[PDB]
Design an enzyme around this catalytic site. Structure first.
Site, PDB file in Angstrom:
ATOM      1  N   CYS A 101       0.874  -1.178   0.000  1.00 38.94           N
ATOM      2  CA  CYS A 101       0.000   0.000   0.000  1.00 38.94           C
ATOM      3  C   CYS A 101       0.907   1.222   0.000  1.00 38.94           C
ATOM      4  CB  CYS A 101      -0.886   0.024   1.229  1.00 38.94           C
ATOM      5  SG  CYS A 101      -1.956   1.480   1.291  1.00 38.94           S
ATOM      6  N   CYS A 104      -0.353   4.114   2.414  1.00 36.87           N
ATOM      7  CA  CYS A 104      -0.549   4.037   3.851  1.00 36.87           C
ATOM      8  C   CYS A 104      -0.152   2.634   4.246  1.00 36.87           C
ATOM      9  CB  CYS A 104      -1.995   4.398   4.247  1.00 36.87           C
ATOM     10  SG  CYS A 104      -3.299   3.635   3.306  1.00 36.87           S
ATOM     11  N   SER A 105      -1.144   1.540   4.326  1.00 33.25           N
ATOM     12  CA  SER A 105      -0.668   0.262   4.935  1.00 33.25           C
ATOM     13  C   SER A 105      -1.615  -0.850   4.558  1.00 33.25           C
ATOM     14  CB  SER A 105      -0.594   0.382   6.455  1.00 33.25           C
ATOM     15  OG  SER A 105      -1.896   0.595   6.989  1.00 33.25           O
ATOM     16  N   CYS A 106      -2.680  -0.449   3.572  1.00 33.84           N
ATOM     17  CA  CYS A 106      -3.780  -1.337   3.243  1.00 33.84           C
ATOM     18  C   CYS A 106      -3.253  -2.737   2.974  1.00 33.84           C
ATOM     19  CB  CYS A 106      -4.523  -0.762   2.050  1.00 33.84           C
ATOM     20  SG  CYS A 106      -4.818   0.966   2.326  1.00 33.84           S
TER      21      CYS A 106
HETATM   22 FE    FE Z   1      -2.944   1.489   3.429  1.00 35.00          FE
END
Ligand code: FE
Ligand code: MG
Ligand code: MG
Ligand code: MG
Ligand code: MG
Ligand code: MG
Ligand code: MG
Lengths: 196, 211
Positions: A101, A104-106
């Protein structure tokens, strides 16, 4: 110039946020504790490993997993927050898939577990989209020159898992034995399953 | 929002801090680290105070140097706290009083967002699409490396979701759109300066146009 803002210790800030909301009756009894337990004990790459081992030993499930990942995952009851629409992506003798991601961190939380610190790092978020071969190499995974690398950037609601190639030397292994070699890093796509 | 969070393709970073299958330790490395996600869910699911998209955007709204020096979970503490203050649920005064010191928040939004696009196209697998050459100052789920670039549809989702550029600002006009897995050749995105093969970006219908 360019200095950090003054800040109270992060623990103090985090607990302040909790206490401010809790003191107003906005946080149900046992709420954050319940989520902590879910994050630690339920969301797990062991679930993704179970799905991979099943796909490896069951051609019909493999086809389902690759065509309707959500339905396949639902059979095990592993849909959840940040894992409601699932697509599994198939490694092949000429293709290696890797997930990030960049924004962000998906991450497919319920089946991969919460993302590790390194996956959320600026280094991974910046570099893997542009130089995945070098990134994987540095991480300890050499991708042969005859293999296309495809990076899936998790930018919307699709949540991904990699279905890695089944390594030689695992013929006839049980699902439990196969699960053991499918690690979190295999599901993200940065590692290839290893046979002792 | 063309913020520092849009990191894909940025050059100058060092090694990823991991070797494959290395022990990553416990899920949470400090006793507070479960709080940002848990309180996000309280905000989203219990209070109905904001959307997950609003959490992404409020983190994007951290002052840029602040974003760059803040560890992951702390960004979400800051983001969730900011939303609680913006929504009138909490005050910054009470947060700082309880924290016993400064608790700087994300910066105010400089955009009201935008509605789901009125005119879009239903695309099919195999069709060639371009990412709309548009600049959005508020929330958007399009990383800049793909703006204006051409790729091929590998998947159209069988579900639809609110347009992030709207629901990320708490707007009432987010509608619903499917998203598309758009496959780009590495060279389409980074010219000669890439060692990859392809990149697949999951793009809302409203970000796309026929090629
Ligand atoms: Fe994310
Ligand atoms: Mg929902
Ligand atoms: Mg390079
Ligand atoms: Mg075989
Ligand atoms: Mg046996
Ligand atoms: Mg940029
Ligand atoms: Mg710090």
């Amino acid at each position: 110039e360019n200095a950090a803002p003054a800040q109270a210790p992060v623990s103090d800030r985090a607990w302040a946020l909790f206490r401010a909301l809790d003191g107003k009756g906005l946080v149900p009894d046992g709420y954050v504790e319940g989520w902590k337990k879910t994050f630690e004990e339920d969301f797990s790459p062991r679930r993704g490993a179970e799905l991979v081992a099943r796909a490896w030993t069951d051609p019909e499930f493999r086809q389902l997993l690759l065509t309707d990942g959500t339905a396949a995952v639902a059979q095990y009851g592993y849909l959840g927050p940040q894992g409601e629409y699932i697509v599994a992506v198939e490694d092949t003798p000429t293709l290696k898939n890797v997930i990030v991601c960049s924004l962000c961190s998906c991450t497919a939380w319920p089946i991969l577990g919460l993302p590790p610190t390194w996956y959320k790092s600026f280094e991974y978020r910046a570099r893997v989209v542009r130089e995945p071969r070098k990134v994987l190499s540095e991480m300890g995974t050499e991708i042969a020159s005859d293999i296309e690398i495809r990076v899936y950037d998790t930018t919307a609601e699709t949540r991904y898992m990699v279905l890695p190639q089944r390594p030689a030397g695992t013929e006839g292994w049980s699902q439990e034995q196969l699960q053991e070699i499918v690690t979190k890093d295999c599901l993200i796509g940065v590692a290839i399953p290893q046979v002792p | 929002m063309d913020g520092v969070h849009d990191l894909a393709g940025v050059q100058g970073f060092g090694k990823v801090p991991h070797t494959v299958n290395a022990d990553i330790g416990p899920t949470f490395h400090a006793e507070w680290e479960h709080l940002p996600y848990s309180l996000m869910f309280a905000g989203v699911a219990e209070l109905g105070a904001f959307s997950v998209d609003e959490v992404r955007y409020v983190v994007e709204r951290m002052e840029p140097r602040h974003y760059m020096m803040t560890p992951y979970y702390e960004r979400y503490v800051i983001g969730v706290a900011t939303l609680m203050v913006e929504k009138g649920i909490l005050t910054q005064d009470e947060l700082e009083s309880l924290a016993g010191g400064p608790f700087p928040l994300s910066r105010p939004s400089e955009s009201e967002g935008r509605p789901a696009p009125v005119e879009t196209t239903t695309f099919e697998v195999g069709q060639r699409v371009r990412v709309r050459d548009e600049y959005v100052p508020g929330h958007i789920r399009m990383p800049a490396y793909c703006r204006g670039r051409v790729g091929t549809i590998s998947h159209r989702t069988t579900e639809k979701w609110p347009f992030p550029d709207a629901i990320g600002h708490g707007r009432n006009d987010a509608g619903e759109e499917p998203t598309y897995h758009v496959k780009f050749a590495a060279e389409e995105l980074f010219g000669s300066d890439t060692d990859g093969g392809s990149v697949v970006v999951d793009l809302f219908e409203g970000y796309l146009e026929p090629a």
